[PDB]
Write a protein that binds this ligand. Structure first.
Ligand SMILES: NC(=O)c1ccc[n+]([C@@H]2O[C@H](COP(=O)([O-])OP(=O)(O)OC[C@H]3O[C@@H](n4cnc5c(N)ncnc54)[C@H](O)[C@@H]3O)[C@@H](O)[C@H]2O)c1
Ligand SMILES: NC(=O)c1ccc[n+]([C@@H]2O[C@H](COP(=O)([O-])OP(=O)(O)OC[C@H]3O[C@@H](n4cnc5c(N)ncnc54)[C@H](O)[C@@H]3O)[C@@H](O)[C@H]2O)c1
Ligand SMILES: NC(=O)c1ccc[n+]([C@@H]2O[C@H](COP(=O)([O-])OP(=O)(O)OC[C@H]3O[C@@H](n4cnc5c(N)ncnc54)[C@H](O)[C@@H]3O)[C@@H](O)[C@H]2O)c1
Ligand SMILES: NC(=O)c1ccc[n+]([C@@H]2O[C@H](COP(=O)([O-])OP(=O)(O)OC[C@H]3O[C@@H](n4cnc5c(N)ncnc54)[C@H](O)[C@@H]3O)[C@@H](O)[C@H]2O)c1
Lengths: 249, 245, 245, 249
C-alpha cells in the first residue's frame, strides 16, 4: 500500500519549514500524524493541509525543550491513535550569530535546550512508547553542522554534533529491541527564514554547495521518509547527509 | 507509478549477491537494466528473473578491471536503449586473507584492479554517456571498510576507502552538470560465503543480525531515484550500527 | 630548552587522572600552571608534585559547570601570572549507567552541564583573555566517544560529540586571530576506576592494552606547543586503534 | 637525549619539500636517516644538509612505485645501519588536473601507482624489517584529500583515501606486534611547486584555510616527528590533520 500505512508518526516543529514538509510526506504515505509546535496557528494549518490531502492528523502544542511537554505529547499520540511508530525530532532554532568568545550565556543555553536537550527529552519518551508497542523508528534532525563548523554559530554546531552522538548511542543500545535511530544532516535549505538573510549572503551560501543551488524542504523530507520506513530496516545509528555536496569539499 | 520508469540502468557484478538484488529492484521499478558480470550463467539467470517479473534486461559480459570492457559496456547500454541514466558500480572481490606484510604482490594488484581502478573505469565512461544525455546518477558500492579496518584484508579496505574518495570528487565536480554520485557502505550481508567466525561477525553489528542484500538494494534504489535529488558526494551506511561503535 | 617556557597554562580537573598527567607535563616543560578541581586536596596535591619537580603551580577551586567559576578561574590566571597562553579543558564525569529511555533527567543534565556546557564556559573566558594577550592555544578533552557510541552513556557520548563540534567552530573562527583550538580523543585509560568488563574493554583496543594518562598528556603537550602551529579545529585520537575498527 | 637517538629512519621522496623537512627533523633528533628519491642530486644534497647539522645519513635511489626498489631500499637501510625503526612514506605526485570523466587512463594509473600502490610496497617491506627488529613506527603521508574532495584531482583524492584505509588496517593488524602506523593529512603547503600555480589560484587556496595562510613544510614535519617518536606510543591506525582548519568547515 502506501509505505507508512497503519503507522502513527510524530513531527516536532512541524508548523513550518522542514517539519512541515516531513509531516506532509508522512500524511501522504498514510501515516496518522501528530503535529507539535510552539505556534498553534501554524500547527493547525499543517493539520488542515494533511486533512485536505485525505490524511489523518491532530495538533498538540508543546515546547520541545520541556521534559513534561515531550512526555505529554507522546501520551497524547498514544491516547489518540493507540501507539507510536515513528518520531521525527525536528524542532530547532538557528541561534544568535557571534564568535564563541562573544557568545551569550543565555543564547547558548537556549540553543542547547531546544536543539539538543529537547531532542533527548523527545527520544526518551518516544522510546518508552515504542518499547511498549513492539519498537519503532526515530529520525533526529541534525545538520551539516553536525560534522563541520558554522562560524559564529558555535552553540548550533555543538548541539547538532551532540544530536549525532545521541543518535549513534540510541541505535547501538536498541539494536536488538527493534528501535532504529538515524540522523539527517541537511545543507542550506530554502525556507522563509532564509529570505531574511541578505542576497549577498545567500549567494555565498550557494557557492558553498557544489550542486549550485539551495535545497528544498521536500528534498529533505524524502530522506526522512526513507529512514522512517521499513525500507531502511538495516540502517541504524547512522548520519545521512542531504547537503548538495557541501561536506564533500 | 514506477519510480525509475523509462530510465536506463547498468549494474556491475549483477549476477549474484547485492548486485542481483540491486538489478531486481531496478527492474521492479521499471528501469531497462543492463546486467554485467564475469560469469555469463549467473548474469543470464539475473536477466531471466527480471524478465519473469515483466521488466526488461540484457546481459553484457565484462571484466570490471578492464577499461575497454567498461567503455564497451556503457556503449552497449546507449546503443541498446538510447541512453544511460543510472549506474551502480557493484562488482568486487574479497581478496586473499593475509596480514599486510604477507600480502602477495599479485593478490594485492588483483583486488586494487577490480575494486578501485575498475570503479573509476566504470564511472569515467558512465559520466561521458550521462553528459550526452543531460545528466544521470551513479551509486558506487563501497563498504563499512570504506571507513573502518578489515584485518587480513588491507587491499579491500584500501580500495573501499578509494571508492569513497572518488565518489566525493565526482559529486563535487559534476554538481552543476546534473550528475550525482553517492556511495553505499554495507555491513556484513547474508550471502553464500565457519559458524564461530559468523557469530563473531554478528556480534559486531548492534542490530544483532547480518543484513540482507534486499536491505542494501533499497538504499541503492533511493539513491538512484529523483527522490535523492539534493544528495551528492555522500557516503551512506547500511550496516546495522557496525560503524556507530 | 623547555618547550612551554614562560607560558601560562590552565588545566581543568587537574587533581587526578589525565588532567594530573597534563598539568605535570606542562609543569615539566616550564609553564606556570593553574590547577583547577572541585576537590581541593587532590588539586593541592597536584600543585605540590609540580613544585617538587621545580615547576610553578597554583590551585583554584572551581566547578567546571559554572560560568562564574570559569570566568573567575581565568581572571585568577591573568591576575597571578599576567596572562593566559594555554588552556586544557579536561574536567568531566562518566555519568550514570542507563539505557537512553531510562536515563534520569537530573543525571542527564549533570553530565551535559559539566562535560558540554562547562567546556564552552571555559573556552569563552579563555578566548577573551587570550585575545588581550595576542593569542593562545586551547586543547579540549573529548573522547573516542566524540565519534563512536558508548552504550549506557548517551549523555557522555552526546557531550563528547559536542566538544568536537565546539572545537571545530573555535578553530575556524579564530584562525586569523592567533588562537588555535584542537580536541583530543582518548581511548580507555588505566586509572583508578569488574575484571571481565576490563577484559572486554581491552579487547576493543587493537594495541591490546589500555592507555596510560602520560600517553594522553604527550599529545596534549604537542597540541599546546608552537610545534603544532598549523594545526587548528582538529580532532586527534589517542585510542590504541579503538576507532580504526 | 634527542628523541630519535639510536633509531634508523627512512624517508621516501626526501629530495625536496615535505620529505626534505621530515628528513632534516629526523636527522636533528639523532636518527640515522636513509634518504630515497628519484632525483639523485636532490637526494645527495639532503644527505649533505643532514651531515652539515652533524647527523648521519645515506642516499639510495628508488622509485616508490616499484616493489623491487622498495625491497632493495629496506635491504640497504638494514645493511647500512643494522635495523629499521621508522619509515615515512612521503613520495607522491599531484597528477593531472581534469574532471573525472576526462581523466586519462595513464595519468590515473601513474597517480595510483606512486601515491597508493607504492605506499603499500614500502609498508610491506618495512613491516618485514620492523618485525625482525622488534617493531617500529610507520607514518604514511596522506592529505586533506584523504577525507575531502579535490575537484579535478580524482586520482589524487582516491589514492590519499586509500592510504588512510591502508593505515587503519596496518594499525589494527599489528597492534600487538609493536608496529604502529598513522597517517598525516596536510593542507596546502608552501612548496616551490606551489610557486608554479598562478597568484589568483594561490589566494583562493589561502581563503580555504581559516588560519589565513599556507602551511610550511617544517610544520608538517613537526607532526610526523611526533608520530614517529615514542611520545605517540598509544596512537595507531589514526589520521592526523595539519591543515590550518581546512577540513573543519
Ligand atoms: N537551512 C535549513 O533550514 C536547515 C539546514 C540544516 C538543518 N536544519 C534543521 O532543520 C530543523 C527545522 O528547521 P527549519 O529550517 O524548518 O526552520 P523553521 O524556523 O522554518 O521551522 C522551525 C519550526 O520549529 C518550531 N519550533 C521552534 N522552537 C520550538 C520549540 N521549542 N518547541 C516546538 N516547536 C518549536 C517553530 O515554531 C517552527 O514551526 C531544525 O532542527 C534546523 O536546525 C535546517
Ligand atoms: N558482506 C557483504 O556481502 C558485503 C559487505 C560490504 C560490501 N560489499 C560489497 O558489495 C559488492 C557485491 O558483493 P557481494 O557480497 O554481492 O558478492 P558476490 O561475490 O556474491 O557478488 C559479486 C559479483 O561480482 C562478480 N564479479 C567479480 N569480479 C568481477 C569483475 N572483475 N568483473 C565483473 N563481474 C565481477 C561476481 O561474479 C559476482 O556475480 C562488492 O563490491 C562488495 O565489496 C559486500
Ligand atoms: N578512560 C578514560 O579515563 C578516558 C577516556 C576518554 C576520555 N576521558 C576524558 O578525560 C577527562 C579526564 O578524566 P579522567 O579519566 O582523568 O577522570 P578522573 O575522575 O580521574 O579525573 C577527573 C577530574 O575532574 C574533576 N572534576 C570532575 N567534575 C568537575 C567539575 N565539575 N569541576 C571541576 N573539576 C571537576 C575530578 O575531581 C577529577 O579530579 C574527562 O573529560 C574524561 O571524559 C577519559
Ligand atoms: N601542499 C602540499 O605540498 C601537500 C599537501 C598535502 C599532502 N602533500 C603530500 O606530501 C608529499 C610530498 O609532497 P611535496 O609537496 O613535498 O612535493 P615535492 O614535489 O616538493 O616533493 C616530492 C618529492 O618526491 C619525489 N618523488 C616523486 N615521485 C617519486 C617516486 N616515484 N619515487 C621516489 N621519489 C619520488 C620527487 O622527486 C620529490 O623529491 C606527497 O605525498 C604529497 O601528496 C603535499
Amino acid at each position: 500500500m502506501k509505505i507508512l500505512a497503519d503507522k502513527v508518526a510524530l513531527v516536532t516543529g512541524s508548523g513550518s519549514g522542514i517539519g512541515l514538509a516531513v509531516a506532509l510526506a508522512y500524511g501522504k504515505e498514510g501515516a496518522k500524524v501528530v503535529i507539535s509546535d510552539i505556534n498553534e496557528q501554524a500547527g493547525n494549518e499543517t493539520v488542515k493541509q494533511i486533512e485536505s490531502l485525505g490524511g489523518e492528523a491532530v495538533f498538540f502544542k508543546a515546547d520541545s525543550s520541556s521534559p513534561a511537554d515531550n512526555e505529554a505529547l507522546v501520551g497524547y499520540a498514544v491516547k489518540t491513535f493507540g501507539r507510536l511508530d515513528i518520531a521525527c525530532n525536528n524542532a530547532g532554532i538557528g541561534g544568535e550569530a557571534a564568535l564563541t568568545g562573544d557568545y551569550s550565556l543565555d543564547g547558548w543555553k537556549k540553543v542547547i535546550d531546544i536543539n539538543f536537550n529537547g531532542v533527548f527529552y523527545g527520544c526518551k519518551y518516544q522510546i518508552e512508547a515504542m518499547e511498549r508497542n513492539g519498537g519503532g523508528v526515530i529520525v533526529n534532525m541534525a545538520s551539516i553542522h553536525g560534522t563541520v563548523a558554522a562560524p559564529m554559530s558555535s552553540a548550533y554546531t555543538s548541539a547538532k554534533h551532540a544530536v549525532v552522538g545521541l543518535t549513534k548511542n540510541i541505535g547501538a543500545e536498541y539494536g536488538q529491541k527493534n528501535i532504529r535511530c538515524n540522523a539527517v544532516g541537511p545543507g542550506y535549505i530554502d525556507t522563509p527564514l532564509l529570505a531574511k538573510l541578505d542576497k549577498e549572503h545567500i549567494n555565498a551560501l550557494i557557492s558553498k554547495h557544489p550542486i549550485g543551488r539551495l535545497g528544498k524542504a521536500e528534498e529533505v523530507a524524502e530522506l526522512v521518509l526513507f529512514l522512517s520506513s521499513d525500507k531502511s530496516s538495516f540502517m541504524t545509528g547512522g548520519y545521512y547527509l542531504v547537503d548538495g555536496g557541501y561536506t564533500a569539499v
